[PDB]
Scaffold this active site. Structure first.
Site, PDB file in Angstrom:
ATOM      1  CG  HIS A   1     -20.417   8.576  -4.208  1.00 12.38           C
ATOM      2  ND1 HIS A   1     -20.546   8.413  -2.846  1.00 12.38           N
ATOM      3  CD2 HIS A   1     -19.152   9.012  -4.416  1.00 12.38           C
ATOM      4  CE1 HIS A   1     -19.413   8.751  -2.255  1.00 12.38           C
ATOM      5  NE2 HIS A   1     -18.548   9.109  -3.187  1.00 12.38           N
TER       6      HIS A   1
ATOM      7  CG  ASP B   1      -1.719   1.306   1.336  1.00  8.12           C
ATOM      8  OD1 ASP B   1      -2.894   1.332   0.913  1.00  8.12           O
ATOM      9  OD2 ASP B   1      -1.166   2.298   1.859  1.00  8.12           O
TER      10      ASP B   1
END
Length: 1008
Positions: A523, A8
């Site tokens: 969204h 990550d």
RNA sequence: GGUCUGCUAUUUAACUUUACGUUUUAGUACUCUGGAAACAGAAUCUACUAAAACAAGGCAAAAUGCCGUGUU
DNA sequence: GTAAAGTTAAATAGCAGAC
């Protein structure tokens, strides 16, 4: 065993996951952390140039005062105390002036010498403080009268000369400084070299190719080395340097493509032959600057309509390469001797682009010993546009320029047919930003260290992470300070023109800031199917609209009777905004507009293929390049960040991500489980193949199939259970950090005997600043105007009570009268107040620089003294320690040593003795064992109070507290004492392992 | 995906200068104080103008002189 | 500590013709 390497990549943290390729068991997992980098700390390189700017004004003055001592116009006996040099440069042109009244008028000029850039252009006046406006205004007023005169005229009337209006061109100064010396010339015997050397010490100045001096790293040796490391290297032969984009040969190679791509419907061969490509160039291309398509196609007898395969600008006219060398040279010279020969022309363009001044060109145009009449060279330097560089060196133009002539090939296929191919430290050259440069560099070190302890992995899968002039406008238009939190809501408000796209009703900004809860950020395509957390997917709408919509597309929810507006009026209002300028994003338009149902699967995999899967491009190819160079087979792929905002969701991973740093290494394991799913399946080997970008099958067919593959809530039970996370925290050993803040503070001594800092409330008559109102009504004893000269004060307090209902009564006051706050005087002649000093908090630590200033009654300090490190000592069963500050570490030529003058005093001031054992040093972020408990050292909270502040390791303490809900003051401040049982120093490798360090001696020298 | 080229927008490194800002000193202005005033000392808040320092410091010696808050 | 004038260069983004 064999293992996947998940990673990550954020700015503050690197997390890694090590899951076995087959067993799915996890071997190790941890997180590597560091502070985000800052490019705003622009200042280092600018100040390096800005500090020399202060020297640029300072160097001129020192030289002329010293030069006069050599000429003996001034001696140490001379006194300059009385002069008012704005009058001396007016009596200077008129009458004979002393040897003391002349050196001043010179030096006040030598200090303030004007600009060369600004004279060239003029403008109109638009009620602004521009430099193109001010110098445009200044010389009209100064056309008749000289600089000092009007400045002096300005001194007589305004009462103030300095400020914005006092900018000028170096000309008027020099024109008047040539006018001045003409008058004292016969009054003091002197040369013409003096009216040369001085006028050169007043006007002359550097230009962008001379560079600074020889010792500076920032400086260079000549004009050749300037370009010789600013021009790129060949795409195919990088060992050379890029040729000039405008050399005759390059400008010719750039034309043998123009026609080796042309297709012409002739019964003969369609792609032009050599003699065609010879005369066209020689008959029309050489003869005409820009050749329209007709000219070539007329000299080469085909119809105009026929020829295709040509580059075309947006307007439609075909563009073919312009020979820049021929026509600039042939417009003044047609002689057989330079113009035929390309190599002559080849060198000429190189000199023109490299060196940058017409005078410096003729010197180097001459050393060619080529045979051009010297009348040409002096006017060959008067051409422009010889700028820029090809993306190909000269060793790569001459080698393959012949094979463009005879054959019909073009550049790409020749390099293919000629077996020529394009090309931690390596991150720097191409990478974009300091933020990324830090993350990648430490991420590479992670990999380079993981394999050493674990071996070559097989799959290294990597994810990356995911307008402040707009803020300044509304915390100043309206007066609502809180414009900092709701950026993502407001960037939407400009881009949608104050409407609710799912309602078409107006959204007032003042109403939205008051009621943000009223309006949400929906969204567009649902997070669960689109996986687009970018800006484009977000649309600022009223809550009730997004409430009524829910989990649907706009076309769906708008068409249903639930929405009052319709697609039809939606369709028309949407596109009108879309066309124009300052316009909406396209994926946005691709998002709102889609009309297909979300549940049909032939739709769902398109989204996952689009946004969800597939510097990122750059980073990967530094990795595969390492692997491909070494004949070492390891597969490396990538996947977008939003995937792990999904896989976290569907597998019901923790929303309240407050456990701390480990919410990174959690991700890398999920990333590792992901590639594993890509790996094992064969319904996924078409989507898991382009991710590794391999050169080439089952694909998913319905939505239950997909939801079968990437929904495994039960098989992930091992990640939450994992309890062997190991953390590594970056320690900044680097010196030459910001020593201290720039601004200088004055001080006083109060009645008690404290030393007290004074500050400045600079801007007056600003709607933003109410602190004039706030500080008066709470402790006005901090105002210098109140203590003494309170006569001015009671006038101040009355407006602060007259408009005491408005945030700053002074704008309201300056609104009415149009006149600034006047200092108390008997006949209204009081000076305008433009700042008001006020007392500050007692200065605990300060950098004393008073000695730079003479005979001052108060101390002069810069705040932000900082402690660098602190060595704990063991003084016979009682634990004491010294703290060493940032200011202490004196810089040197190639190292940063510690001042033993202050460290030794600090050993006595801390009651340390010679006999005590020495315990290691503890820089910020290092780890320490006090009383068997382990924490990370933030620094010395207080040397005098025998304190240090630490913070936790697997979490930030505030966040631990918020889990504990205790609400102690959320900082740890452990107190060194005799009672402290143990002091051990623990550090961590980059992987996260902890290791005890044994120290015997303290060091004082760091090399940077 | 990539190599060249043409137009426009971008950002970043390095360079070159600008007129302000803070601060010290000297002067004057403003304020107090003594007084018919010439002025007088007291303060240094308030302003103006000039000189000088503006990361502590470190080199370098007639110079369009140089480094100093960034990253590894 | 801060705003206003310049220049070269590396690089990306977007648009077009080609392999």
């Amino acid at each position: 065993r064999n293992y996947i390497l998940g990673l990550d990549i954020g700015i503050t943290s690197v997390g890694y996951g090590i899951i076995d390729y087959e067993t799915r068991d996890v071997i190790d997992a941890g997180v590597r952390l560091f502070k985000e980098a800052n490019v705003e700390n622009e200042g280092r390189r600018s100040k390096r140039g800005a500090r020399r700017l202060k020297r640029r004004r300072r160097h001129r003055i020192q030289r002329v005062k010293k030069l006069l001592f050599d000429y003996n116009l001034l001696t140490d006996h001379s006194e300059l105390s009385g002069i008012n040099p704005y009058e001396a440069r007016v009596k200077g042109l008129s009458q004979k002036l002393s040897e003391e009244e002349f050196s001043a008028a010179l030096l006040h000029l030598a200090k303030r010498r004007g600009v060369h850039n600004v004279n060239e252009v003029e403008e109109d006046t638009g009620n602004e403080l521009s430099t193109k406006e001010q110098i445009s205004r200044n010389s009209k007023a100064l056309e008749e009268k000289y600089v000092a005169e009007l400045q002096l005229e300005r001194l007589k009337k305004d009462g103030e000369v300095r400020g914005s209006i006092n900018r000028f061109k170096t000309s008027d100064y020099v024109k008047e400084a040539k006018q001045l010396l003409k008058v004292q010339k016969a009054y003091h015997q002197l040369d013409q070299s003096f009216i040369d050397t001085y006028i050169d010490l007043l006007e002359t100045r550097r230009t962008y190719y001379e560079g600074p001096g020889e010792g500076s790293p920032f400086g260079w040796k000549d004009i050749k080395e300037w370009y010789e490391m600013l021009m790129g290297h060949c795409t195919y032969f990088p060992e050379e340097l890029r040729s000039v984009k405008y050399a005759y040969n390059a400008d010719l190679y750039n034309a043998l493509n123009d026609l080796n791509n042309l297709v012409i419907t002739r019964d003969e061969n369609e792609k032009l032959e050599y003699y065609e490509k010879f005369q066209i160039i020689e008959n029309v291309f050489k003869q005409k600057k820009k050749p329209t398509l007709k000219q070539i196609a007329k000299e080469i007898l085909v119809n105009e309509e026929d020829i295709k395969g040509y580059r075309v600008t947006s307007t439609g006219k075909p563009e073919f390469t312009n020979l820049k060398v021929y026509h600039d040279i042939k417009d003044i010279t047609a002689r057989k001797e330079i113009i035929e020969n390309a190599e002559l022309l080849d060198q000429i363009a190189k000199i023109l682009t490299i060196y940058q001044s017409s005078e410096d060109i003729q010197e180097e145009l001459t050393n060619l010993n080529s045979e051009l009449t010297q009348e040409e060279i002096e006017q060959i330097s008067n051409l422009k546009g010889y700028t820029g560089t090809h993306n190909l060196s000269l060793k790569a133009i001459n080698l393959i320029l012949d094979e463009l002539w005879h054959t019909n090939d073009n550049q790409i296929a020749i390099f293919n047919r000629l077996k020529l191919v394009p090309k931690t430290t390596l991150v720097d050259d191409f990478i974009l930003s300091p933020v990324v440069k830090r993350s990648f560099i430490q991420s590479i070190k992670v990999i380079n260290a993981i394999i050493k302890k674990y071996g070559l992995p097989n799959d290294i899968i990597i994810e990356l992470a995911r307008t402040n002039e707009r803020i300044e406008e509304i915390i100043r238009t309206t007066g609502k300070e809180n414009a900092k939190y709701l950026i993502e809501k407001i960037k939407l408000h400009d881009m949608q023109e104050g409407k609710c796209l799912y309602s078409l009703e107006a959204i007032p900004l003042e109403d939205l800031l008051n009621n943000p809860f009223n309006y949400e950020v929906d969204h567009i395509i649902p997070r669960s199917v689109s996986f687009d957390n970018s800006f484009n997917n977000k649309v600022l709408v009223k809550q009730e609209e997004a409430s009524k919509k829910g989990n649907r597309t706009p076309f769906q929810y708008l068409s249903s009777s639930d929405s009052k507006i319709s697609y039809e009026t939606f369709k028309k209002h949407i596109l009108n905004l879309a066309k124009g300028k300052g316009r909406i994003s396209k994926t946005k338009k691709e998002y709102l507009l889609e009309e297909r149902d979300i549940n049909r699967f032939s739709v769902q995999k398109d989204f996952i293929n689009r946004n969800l899967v597939d510097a990122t491009r750059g980073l990967m190819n530094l990795l595969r390049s390492y692997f491909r160079v070494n004949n070492l087979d390891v597969k490396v792929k990538s996947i977008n960040g939003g995937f792990t905002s999904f896989l976290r969701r569907k597998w019901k991973f923790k929303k309240e991500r407050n456990k701390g740093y480990k919410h990174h290494a959690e991700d890398a394991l999920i990333i590792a489980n992901a590639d594993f799913i890509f790996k094992e399946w064969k319904k996924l080997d078409k989507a898991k193949k382009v991710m590794e970008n391999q050169m080439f099958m089952p694909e998913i067919e319905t939505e239950q199939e997909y939801k079968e593959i990437f929904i495994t809530p039960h098989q992930i039970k091992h990640i939450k259970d994992f309890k062997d996370y190991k953390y590594s925290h970056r320690v900044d050993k680097k010196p030459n950090r910001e020593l201290i803040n720039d601004t200088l503070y004055s001080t006083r001594k109060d009645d008690k005997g404290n030393t007290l800092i004074v500050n400045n409330l600079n801007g007056l008559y600003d709607k933003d600043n109410d602190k004039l109102k706030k500080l008066i009504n709470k402790s006005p004893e901090k105002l210098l105007m109140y203590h003494h000269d309170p006569q001015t004060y009671q006038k101040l307090k009355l407006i602060m009570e007259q408009y005491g209902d408005e945030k700053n009564p002074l704008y309201k006051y300056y609104e009415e009268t149009g006149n600034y706050l006047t200092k108390y005087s008997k006949k209204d002649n009081g000076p305008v107040i433009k700042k008001i000093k006020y007392y500050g908090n007692k200065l605990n630590a300060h950098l004393d620089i008073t000695d730079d200033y003479p005979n001052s009654r108060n101390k002069v300090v810069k705040l932000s003294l900082k402690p660098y490190r602190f060595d704990v000592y063991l003084d016979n069963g009682v634990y004491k320690f010294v703290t060493v500050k940032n200011l202490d570490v004196i810089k040197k030529e190639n190292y940063y040593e510690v001042n033993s003058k202050a460290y030794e005093e600090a050993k006595k001031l801390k009651k340390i003795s010679n006999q005590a054992e020495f315990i290691a040093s503890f820089y910020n972020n290092d780890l320490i064992k006090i009383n068997g408990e382990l924490y990370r050292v933030i620094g010395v909270n207080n040397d005098l109070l025998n304190r240090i502040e630490v913070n936790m390791i697997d979490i930030t303490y505030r966040e631990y507290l918020e889990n504990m809900n205790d609400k102690r003051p959320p900082r740890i401040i452990k107190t060194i004492a005799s009672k402290t049982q143990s002091i051990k120093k623990y550090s961590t490798d980059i992987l996260g392992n902890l290791y005890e360090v044994k120290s015997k001696k303290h060091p004082q020298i760091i090399k940077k």
